[PDB]
Amino acid sequence: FPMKQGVLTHGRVRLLLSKGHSCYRPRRTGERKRKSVRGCIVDANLSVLNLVIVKKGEKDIPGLTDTTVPRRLGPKRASRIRKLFNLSKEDDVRQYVVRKPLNKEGKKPRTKAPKIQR
Amino acid sequence: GISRDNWHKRRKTGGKRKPYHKKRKYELGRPAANTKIGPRRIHTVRVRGGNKKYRALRLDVGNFSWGSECCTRKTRIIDVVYNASNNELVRTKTLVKNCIVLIDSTPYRQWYESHYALPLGRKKGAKLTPEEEEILNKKRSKKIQKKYDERKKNAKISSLLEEQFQQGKLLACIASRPGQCGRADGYVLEGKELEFYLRKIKAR
RNA sequence: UACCUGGUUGAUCCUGCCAGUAGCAUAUGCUUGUCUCAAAGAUUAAGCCAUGCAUGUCUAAGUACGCACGGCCGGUACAGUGAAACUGCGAAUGGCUCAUUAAAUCAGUUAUGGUUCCUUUGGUCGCUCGCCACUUGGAUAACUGUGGUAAUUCUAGAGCUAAUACAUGCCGACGGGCGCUGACCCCCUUCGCGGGGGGGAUGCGUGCAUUUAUCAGUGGUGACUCUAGAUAACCUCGGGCCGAUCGCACGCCCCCCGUGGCGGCGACGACCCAUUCGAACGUCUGCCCUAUCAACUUUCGAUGGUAGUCGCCGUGCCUACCAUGGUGACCACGGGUGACGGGGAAUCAGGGUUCGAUUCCGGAGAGGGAGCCUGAGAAACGGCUACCACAUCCAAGGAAG
RNA sequence: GUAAUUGGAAUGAGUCCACUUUAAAUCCUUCCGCGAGGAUCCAUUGGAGGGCAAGUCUGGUGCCAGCAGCCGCGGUAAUUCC
Structure with a gap:
């Protein structure tokens, strides 16, 4: 039973979870099911926990701080291609779009483009 | 969910009636708003059909009306002095439709x-x-x-x-229904209606 | 077919009831070759139920970036298909049963001389004077990867990405116009005068709708606090509208010039207004047995008057102050009902007696009672939460009904 | 009407294609074929005193067993019992 931001009862309480909090895929509209959750204080009774670096230290942690994995689904709206590529004005948003290459063995080599929005 | 229907009332000859159905949603429950004076907070409620009545939780200003010269302006609200139904609702400062x-x-x-x-x-x-x-x-x-x-x-x-212009404050009468609409409008006392309340306020 | 026959006696005539007779209808007994219609776990136990199920859903027209498929037929926006996921809309209908409930349910009835009600249809949707508008904003799922307990339609973490999801907000229209305020016209009685106009600089308020107050009585009704018009104001930050939407055939004028101004068909939309399917509340009238049920209701709203609270709205539906009322032998009130009501059914000289859980319409409830969110509509139960009664898994840490 | 002898442009149940119906099939409808002599390919349920149509025919029982909705029959010849 996972943790939740701000409960802090270092144990297991039961919450009435509606649509949009966490821990509950609300199986139809407006439903509020009562589900147990774990308080946000960390204890010794956890099988696993998640933990995220925010300032880089010393060494090549193998498989952790090397191998920058690309965000291969690039920006698609015409304000997020207008957010990283500095394509200012009259630069024809189509012409410097991202494209996504594909490499199946049996089929032909192809690249592949999105739609566009706005 | 306190209904306001009639199968829980004793009928005319003085004999009770047995209910045959549950209390339905089209007699929705009744939590009173009890609009008091402070800074403005207005809360909304969906009703049948899909309208949104604004209800008044705490009010400051109204849009009261002069009457005899048709001067309708805003004004802040100073005090509650007298209420028609209950003497208890003046001493908890509650804006209702006839205070x-x-x-x-x-x-x-x-x-x-x-x-x-x-x-x-x-x-x-x-x-x-x-x-x-x-x-x-x-x-x-x-x-x-x-x-x-x-x-x-x-x-x-x-x-x-x-x-009372020389002494500061006009005593008015609310005409809107706060907690149902979300404003405290009204007219201004004058005439024999003003003598009626000024008799019934000073005599207390 | 408005119909009778046997029985108290040693025989008679009666009063009587028993029995026969014929329907119809649940059940059963024995028998059963043909064919076509065809009722069928309602009578007790509205008792509990194994499992398998009974509601989900795309068109060229909301969002493709799964190589999941397709000739990429060409130097890059999408050749089209398409699992999923976001979004919408259904699931409030149908079906099942009769435990309740005896004025409740139910049925009737109500020329330019100036250049309350999603959807449906049918309107309204440049009517408002007001420094991105050739397109403004952040996040989220599918997916990639990393996980956790025995498990549940359980889901955590990291990074991506869209909108008809959630936002934010304006050119245009649009020049002005309307009402009030308020420097300018002396030509009128300016005679020391008293005057009377047209027009003005300025500065406001300006539509639909929400809320309050005032004046007059365009179209309406035995009837209006109707609709509408004039005024002075408001405009809820969990906030009203003024389309930052998607397809289809494309064509026109290209004269600033190969860049721009126009156009038709739509699909979605959109507070309002009517409309239909409705719903809820009501008016009068109508029900079975019971006096071994004659007084009931009023502390706990009982019956009326003001004023208010919420309520979609009318009202003791509440609250608060007052008044002392209301019902009854024309049977109130209480009890029973092996009572769901109605269309109707069996039977029939006329008159009736009984049945109706049952496919049509109306009511109710999904083990018992309560509480709710979402939605337009649910106090839904093939939605949830709690309790009480019943029961299931378990690695006993917890899960599901 | 027995007891008959035959029969033959007589046939249905039954077994059998095939078409048809149907969403797919089934009946059924049509249609080769086979298919009746104690047509053994066979009809029961209740009664036979009176009400109430139908028997004092036989055997057994002996107020026993039992019948009978009512009246009644039952005690060594029963129109009611098996």
Whole structure:
């Protein structure tokens, strides 16, 4: 039973979870099911926990701080291609779009483009 | 979910009735708003059909009405002095649809100085020269004097009503239903209606 | 077919009831070759139920970036298909049963001389004077990867990305116009005068709708606090509208010039207004047995008057102050009902007696009672939460009914 | 009407294609074929005193067993019992 931001009862309480909090895929509209959750204080009774670096230290942690994995689904709206590529004005948003290459063995080599929005 | 239906009432001959169905959603429950005076917070409720009645939790201002000269302006709300149904709801400061509520004078002051140009609220003199004597004179022509010296005849106010302009606050009556609509509007007491409440307030 | 026959006696005539007779209808007994219609776990136990199920859903027209498929037929926006996911809309209908409930349910009835009600249809949707508008904003799922307990339609973490999801907000229209305020016209009686106009600089308020107050009585009704018009104001930050939407055939004028101004068909939309399917509340009238049920209701709203509270709205539906009322032998009130009501059914000289859980319409409830969110509509139960009664898994840490 | 002898442009149940119906099939409808002599390919349920149509025919029982909705029959010849 996972943790939740701000409960802090270092144990297991039961919450009435509606649509949009966490821990509950609300199986139809407006439903509020009562589900147990774990308080946000960390204890010794956890099988696993998640933990995220925010300032880089010393060494090549193998498989952790090397191998920058690309965000291969690039920006698609015409304000997020207008957010990283500095394509200012009259630069024809189509012409410097991202494209996504594909490499199946049996089929032909192809690249592949999105739609566009706005 | 307190319904307001009728199968829980004893019928006319004095014999109880047995219910045959549950209490339905089209007699939705009734939590009273009990609108009090402070800064403005308004809460919304969906009803049948999909309308959103604004309900009034805490109010400051209203849009009260002069009446005899048709001057409808805003005013902040000062105090609650008298209520028709229960004597308990004045001492918890609750704005309802028929509580005699107490507003200020300065929109009605400054309009009467604007439409007729008469001194009002200023009772002695000799403190009102630089910004406060420039309300009546304003460089009128001969013909603007012609159409504002004839406005001394339609300028009169009932005796008890300029008297509280000199003493500060108008006692009004709410006419809207706060907690159902979300405003505390109303008219201003004057006439024999004002003598009715002023009898029933002082005598307490 | 408005119909009778045997029985108290040693025989008679009666009063009587028993029995026969014929329907119809649940059940059963024995028998059963043909064919076509065809009722069928309602009578007790509205008792509990194994499992398998009974509601989900795309068109060229909301969002493709799964190589999941397709000739990429060409130097890059999408050749089209398409699992999923976001979004919408259904699931409030149908079906099942009769435990309740005896004025409740139910049925009737109400020329230019100036250049309350999603959807449906049918309107309204440049009517408002007001420094991105050739397109303004952040996040989220599918997916990639990393996980956790035995498990549940359980889901955590990291990074991506869209909108008809959630936002934010304006050119245009649009020049002005309307009402008030308020420097300018002396030509009128300016005679020391008293005057009377047209027009003005300025500064406001300006539509639909929400809320309050005032004046007059365009179209309406035995009838209006109707609709509408004139005024002075408001405009809820969990906030009203003024389309930052998607397809289809494309064509026109290209004269600033190969860049721009126009156009038709739509699909979605959109507070309002009517409209239909409705719903809820009501008016009068109508029900079975019971006096071994004659007084009931009023502390706990009982019956009326003001004023208010919420309520979609009318009202003791509440609250608060008052008044002392209301019902009854024309049977109130209480009890029973092996009572769901109605269309109707069996039977019939006329008159009736009984049945109706049952496919049509109306009511109710999904083990018992309560509480709710979402939605337009649910106090839904093939939605949830709690309790009480019943029961299931378990690695006994917890899960599901 | 027995007891008959035959029969033959007589046939249905039954077994059998095939078409048809149907969403797919089934009946059924049509249609080769086979298919009746104690046509063994066979009809029962209740009664036979009176009400109430139908028997004092036989054997057994002996107020026993039992019948009978009512009246009644039952005690060594029963129109009612098996």
